[PDB]
Every structure is written in structure tokens, then in C-alpha cells.
Amino acid sequence: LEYSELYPIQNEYRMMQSLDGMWKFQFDPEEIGKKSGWENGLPAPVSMPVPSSFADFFTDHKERDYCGDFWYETEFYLPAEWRNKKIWLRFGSITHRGTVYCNGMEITSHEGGFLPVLADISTVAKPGQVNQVVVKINNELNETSLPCGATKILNNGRKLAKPYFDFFNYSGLQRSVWVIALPEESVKDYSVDYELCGTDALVKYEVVTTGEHPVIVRLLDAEGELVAETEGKEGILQVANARLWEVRNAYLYQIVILITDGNGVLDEYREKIGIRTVRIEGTKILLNDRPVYLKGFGKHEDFPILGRGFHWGIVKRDFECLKWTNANCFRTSHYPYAEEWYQFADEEGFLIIDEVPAVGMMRSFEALTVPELLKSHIADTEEMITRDKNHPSVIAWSLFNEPETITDYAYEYFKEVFAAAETYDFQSRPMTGAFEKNSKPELCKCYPLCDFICLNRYYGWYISGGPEIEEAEELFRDEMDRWKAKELNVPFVFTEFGTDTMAGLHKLPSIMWSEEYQKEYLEMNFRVFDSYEFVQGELAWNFADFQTTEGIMRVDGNHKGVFTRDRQPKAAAVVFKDRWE
């Protein structure tokens, strides 16, 4: 990458200033901002919070549903001390694509709305003065970038997003924004990998810097005491009597990476890491050499009013609810989340399946757009893995959600994605993706690429729901018998199963949409899961009710949450709590 993904820190060598707050904002329905000087300042802005999704603030439909180009602006004072450092704007994300301007100059563009955007403003920054940042953003959906969809044109050329995915097209500056200053020679990237040796451990590492001066690497324990030190950009840290990072029982060391000159230090980067191994052995998932059964949910970055906007309060509540259910895992369905979610999972000992936004890829892999889509998918995979690889919580990469997989075309597409992912992950940890039912065991060509197989299944909701639930159970067992007979010797994880459930809808006997049917559906699914030895995890769809596009199938978004949108449990939450205990 031509920039660093490393989370920003502040110390003697690195500086950081938050640009979060109220920005200026303007919609651009006629696509005239870049023709009209807007990169030097918006002509008739309103106020917009950052971080946040813009949609749910407004009281009119056309602003909520806006699709097209729209702009953000803010001003910030840069301390004179930052002069001649490498100065960058760092956006947690820009959703979905955009161009960054600073002091009237085009700096960089980015495609992909769920990973950091880094803009090098070293040559245009004004130290000791007020500076301006303007961002042109676009939130249309197409078939050459992730997540996929279409853009419809209504009356008066008003655009409307048409997702191929079941979540609302929230967009804007949904994560924190910083301006930062780095030394001219800096730590750009590093990678760690672990090996357990009886009661000791090895931390294998590589460091990439932007120069040729010597590198020293230190490892500190949780108290800040030195436990290992080595020289060189590649090496091994030896840790006696290592305190391993364990499921729901974390321990974090600090890695400290120094570039030295004398005599003297040029840069220092520090980050918490956790010593742990993950691997697949037969049908088991092993964490530090012991089998673990995954228990948890698919989530979303979704909360009332803020949309996908980041807030630590949402993280805290969601983790307290997860712990109360006795979960140990979640999937970042269906896009990488803000970095802070992983930082917190590292602290709390949660396991993460980190998912790239490759959703919306099946009708309703032969279009001439596919090679461009592949390039986008591989780029987002590179960025995700480079950003997230050193979190101990991240134990697997999900590289798709419900694509077509039964053609040779699809196999060739995913072979390239998996090959790229493998080159980027220093740990070579498990790679997977979530399969929809159309990927029948007789037809699917892509499950062999996976270290373990993730299934999304809705036997008892979309298939034979309600009065037909006993037929659903038989259909489900018939499919799992089909997988069983293939003797693949790999773990299977259910990454989705659920029922829309309206809080407060009670019925005896139960009906589809009632709280009681959610419980009965879950109990039937558990009976099926527990009938197969190779099942090794269950992540329910969804942790919480969340927003979708309006339609006749969605009663104020998706109600398959086990919790409501405001994070309170439906009756089925206790079913999980009791089973997972």
C-alpha cells in the first residue's frame, strides 16, 4: 500500500488531532461541486455530525434517501511544531467512495466505504495556520465495487440506491477523522505470528519502515515490564512463561517498535497484541491447541439516529449484552467495522470473523464488469487484512457472503481472491466465506477453497416456515446428511439462522413473527446442529434488529435480532444464554 494502516498514536515522534465534531455539509444533486469551486469551500452548507451516517437526521424523504455526490468540509488549526513532518489526514472510512482535498488541492481518492483512507497533505499543509479539508463523497451502488447494487433514476434525475444486499445504504463520514504527523522515516507496517513452545512462546515478526535505519523491537507485559527484545526488521521475540490470550480471558502484551539513529530514536510505534494460535485440525477449530466451539452472532454497525456512526457507547453496551448471552464470537457482517470494535474484542477475549464487503454478488460472474469487480474485491481484502491482522481477536477472514459459487467462472474468481488474501496474511489464519442455500453440496465449486465452511440457512423461515416447520427440519437434516456423506473432514459453522420477530408479538400457539416462534425455531435448529459432529460453531442472525431498505418484506428494517435495536432482549435471548452457558 502507498500509506500506513496503523492506528494513530501520540508520543514524542507522532502527533494526532481529532477532527470529529460538526462539519459543514452540502448535497450536490446536479454534480456541479467540482465545476463550481466547492473544493475551496461549500457555498451553502448545513451542519453535519462526524462521525455519523447523514441519513436519519433529516425530516424529509429526499434528504434521507439522497443518492449521488455530497460534500463535507471542516477547518482545523495545525500547530507550528508539525512543520516539515509527514502530515496525513486519516479517515476511519469514507462511505462509499471519495476524493479528499486540502487547502484547495486534490490529495487522494478512494473506493470502498469501510476501511481507512489516508491522504498525504505534507506538501500542502500550513503549519501554524488554519487549514481546510473538503471531501467529495459518492454513495451510489454498482457492479464494479463492493457492496454491489444499482442506482435508479427517478423524476428530475433524482437518484435512488437499489442495493443487492439486505441493509440500508447508510453513507457519509461514519468514523472518526484525524490529522496526524509522522517522522520522515517511520514505521509503516508490521506483522506478528505466534508459536507455542510448552510454557514459552515465540513472537515472529516483520517490520516495514520508510527508510534504512536500524530497528529495535521490544515486548512489554501487561504491567509494562520488558520481557523480550531483538534487533532487526525481521526477528523472533522469545517469551518465557508466556501468558496466552484466551477466549473470554484476554491477556495483552505491548509491542514497541523503534527506529534508531544514534544514539537516538527516530520513531516509536506501540500496539497491544495477544499471544495465541488458531488452526483447523480435522473438523475442529483449535485456539491455543484446544478445541473451541463458536457461539455468538452476526452484527451490524447500526444504531438509532447515528446509523453506522461509531460510538464507544454502542461498543460497550453490545459487549455487555454479548457477555450476558455467554457468547464468544461475532462476525463483522457484512463489512469491516471501525477499528475500535477489534481493539475492544482484544480486551474482552472475543473471537472475530472479519468480513470484506463482498455481498450482493448473485442474481437476482460472467459480466464484462467482473474483472473490475475482482480488482475492487482484492483491494478491499488487502486493506482489511493489512489493517486487522495484528488483532488477537481476529481468527478468520470471511471473503464473501452469499455469492454465486456453482459455476467454473465463480471458482476462478474466488481462487484469485483467496490467493491474494493468503499473500497478505502473515499468520495464514483461516479463510472462509458464507454460503447461501443455492450453493448446493452437489453443485458448489468453491467450498474447497475454504479452511472451514460457513452456512447461512433459514429452514423454518424462508423455507417451510410456520405450520411446515417439521418439513423444514427434515429438509435441513437431508441437506446436512448430504454434506456429511461428502466426508470433507472440515468444520462447519452456521453463520446465519433466524426469524423476524416483532418485540411484543405474542401468540399461543406461535406464529411466524412472534417471540414464541423465534424460540421454537432456534430449538429446532439446535437439534439439527447437534446431530452432526462436524458442526463447530453457531452465529445467529442477528445480534440486533437493524435498518434496511424499505419494502413489503421489512417492517422498519430487519427484525431477526435477538435484541431490539435499542439493545434489549427478546424472549429468545435467554434461550441462547442458557444454551451457551
Place this chain on the structure above:
Amino acid sequence: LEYSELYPIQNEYRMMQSLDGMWKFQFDPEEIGKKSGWENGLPAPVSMPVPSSFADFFTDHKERDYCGDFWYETEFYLPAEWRNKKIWLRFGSITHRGTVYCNGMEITSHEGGFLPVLADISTVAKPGQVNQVVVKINNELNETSLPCGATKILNNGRKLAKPYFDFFNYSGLQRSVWVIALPEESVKDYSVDYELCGTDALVKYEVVTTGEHPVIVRLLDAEGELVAETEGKEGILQVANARLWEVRNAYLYQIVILITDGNGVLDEYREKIGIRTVRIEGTKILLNDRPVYLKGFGKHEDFPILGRGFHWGIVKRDFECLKWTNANCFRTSHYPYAEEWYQFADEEGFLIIDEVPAVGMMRALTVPELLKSHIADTEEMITRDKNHPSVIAWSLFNEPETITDYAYEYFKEVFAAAETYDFQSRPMTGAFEKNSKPELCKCYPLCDFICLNRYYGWYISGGPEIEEAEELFRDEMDRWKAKELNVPFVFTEFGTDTMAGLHKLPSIMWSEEYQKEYLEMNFRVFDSYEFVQGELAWNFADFQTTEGIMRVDGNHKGVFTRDRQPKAAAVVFKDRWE
């Protein structure tokens, strides 16, 4: 005050760094922290977001309902370039009271949970190093500090807050936290007051600094162009063809305050202000010499999960909802809000009645101490908020006892204090409950306009008795009319608990239809009296209260739900206020 209330800014002379994020946090039920050295670091902390109330994160009752001492900690790197500056920790608030430590040293304490806390760490800060802040906080309620209540001790020693007020006892670090650096000689306070002179205006000002060097004051228009400049710590800026700040049609100038020596500028403070006048003339409220009728709500700082935690998103949604109803005013019921609410009101042209947390004083040797607390909170509120053009009135109480001579003497002291702190001498008021009968109340003459909280049709003769409620309401208003006080009356509360989705024909108390009918009846009564000059409905949105047999998941008198969506009655306000 021994510190500045001015909002922090960043420029060549002033630096700021946000401490918002995940802090460490630990409950201290046995009150052992200080004897155990927790000011040097918490021994077994959990993570806590800042800004936020702590209560609604947890999944267990005892943590949600925690009452007593509890502690926060974080660490921050201080740039070496901040050496030789005055360095302060600035808390938007610390709820309700606390003691700030930095690098293990006690810095300052504060009582009062809704206004800034400033801690001067100049003598203990370590530039170029990692620094530590630890705060001991307590959230108990008593009768000598605001808002009032009691603390119950359960038989096992566990404490439980018992408010004398109808809102949940949220607490913690609910607002943003900064560490800031100021020049050694700085602008500490300033005040502006406006006079209209034909097409022109005068901005009278005073500036307080921490030294003796000369002061220059400049006024810039909204395009940053210089329109007036003068010298001295007291002066008058003359503005030709002034663009006045108008209701729901703001214009903001920028005041720029410079301290200089013979070699240049020492400090620069700048803030947006709006040229406008407010006064009461007979039964009218005049804004820029024209009557205005107040239309809007009482609010709360209250949102799901965050509690009272500050977030600009809540500000943005709430103002879009307010504008959609065609409101022009809100009261900061029942405590000053985060500063950002007022900044945004200034931009949007909303009028604010700014209220000190003098709530829970209705049915001692504790009264003199309560008065001291009440006056200190008043001083801090007015010093913090006086230069916002949106703030047009101070509310100095909500539903106290007012019928005794004793209460008159108490409130005479509060109002006299408020007058001394407000350079603009803006209108002053408070909200009265029905027990303050027109024949008995001794305090309404202290007020420049009278604010009434009424619930005719809810607590009085509700439901099938609403016709009687209307007659009782007209009887009381006829009693006020006959007194011919020649002051404006504003209804600061009226409403009905209303469950979203509860529909009934004919209506019942708690249904959406009854909320509409109740509001229509109240409007018929309001419109019957010339001296009524505003109506602020209770409440903008459903909000959290203490649990009880009268509160179904908090207070449901909102016109919006807690997640900011309109009940049926919201359209009734929209149509009326258009």
C-alpha cells in the same frame, strides 16, 4: 470564579487535546479508594465510554442503580511544546461532585453536576511525557446541593438514590473532556450587551484577563470582515447597518479579543455572538423591539444507552425535529445543558430559557447551605452562557415551595445574585407548580415574566373529567387575569403520558388520541388570555425516570418518542405553530 468558563479553542496561543474515548472505571462501594491509593491508578478497572452516563451499559441491576463513590482514569501524552503554558483539565461536567487528580496529586473539587469543572495542572503536568488523570466522583443526592433528593441505605449497606425530581439519576462523565494549554496572560472572561440605534448597533463589552497588558477588541462579520475595533478592557463597538440575530433567522458576528504587549499579541480569544435585544414590556416579550410568542418544548439531555451523554448527532436530530414542528424555543429543563446545545441554537436562531438545577425543592438548618449551592450554580451558569444570543432568559427554579415568607427571602437572594452576574440584565423567571396558588404565592413578583407548569386534564380532572379540567383551568386563569399583573405568562409544562401505538376511540388517558385532545383543550384556554405569551410543551421526547408504579419505562409525555419519532400529537403542534 478562580478559572475561566470560556469554551476551548485552538490557535497560535491556545491548544487543546480531546480526552474523550474509553476510560478506566471502578465502582467503590466500600469507599476505600483514597486510602488504597486509587488516585495513582485503579486496581481492577473496567472500560467506560466518555462522554456517557454509566448506568445503561450494564446488564445487572446493582451496577445500573449504583449510588455512591466511583472512579474514572485515563492517560494522555502531553506535547513538549506545551511547556511554559498554563495547562488545565477541562470537564464539560462531573456528575454530581468530584475530586480531580493528576499524576497522583489532588488538584480541585467541585459540587454541581451540570457545569464545567476546570483543574489547573500547570504545576504537576509533565510535557513530553505520558500523564495520568484520575477522578473520584459521587452521585448521591441530598438537601444541600442541586438537584435535591435523598440517599437510602439498604440493609446490606448498598446505597440507592431517591430523587425529589422526575428524571433518572444519571451520572459519571457525561460531557466531553479536554486537556488545554493557555498563555500565561490570558483572556479569562468577557461580557457583551447590545443597544439598537436605528439601523446601527452598539456592542458594549467588558473583558477580564489574568494580567495587566492592553486589550484590543475586534468584531468581524459573518464573512470575516472587520466591522469595528476598539481598545481597552471596557468599551463600545459601533456597528453600522448591523445585521441583527433574529428568531429562526440567525446572523453571527465574531468577537476577537487580543491581549498585546510591545512586541505583539499574547493571547487571542474568538467566539461567535449575535446582536439582539431582549426585554419585557407589559405582557409582551420583545426581541429586537418586536413581540415574540414562544413556541416549543421542555427537553432533557436523554437518549438511549448514552443517558445524558453528549453527542452532536442528538443535537442535529433534535433541532431538525424542532424546526419541523415550527418551534422557536426550548427550556433547558432542569439543568444547564452541554455548551454545544447553545452554540447550535445560536446558529439556528432558537431562543433558550436557561435553567439552573433547582428542582426537587418542594415538600431546615440545611437551607443556608442549599442557598449557597444554588447561588454558586447560578453564577457558573450565567458566566458560562451569558454571551449566547440564544439565551434570552434565566430560569432560577422549577416547582419549589413559594408560599412562605421564608421562600421569598431565599429567592430574593438568588435573583439578586443572578442580576449581579448578568451583564445584560436579561429577563429572569422560574417555573411554578399549581400549589403556588395566585392567592398564596409570594415569589412571582420577583419574576420578569411568569412560567406556569400545569396539568389540567392529566393530574387534575383527567379523562372523563376533562370538561371539568377545562373549567378549573379557566377558573385559575381568571384569578390571574383579575390580578392585572401586566406581565407575560409562559406555560412551561403541560402534557399527558402517551404510549406510542395505544389508540382508542373514544380516547383514553395514555392514548395518542387523548394527547391530541388534551393539547387542543389547553390551546383553547391559552388563547383566551391576552397575557399568555408562550407555550413550551412537556416534553419534547419520552425520557428516563426512576422506576415506579407511575412510570412505564420513564416518562411518556414526549411528543416524540425517545428515539426521536413523532406521535400523533406532533402534527398538532406543527400545524398550530406554522
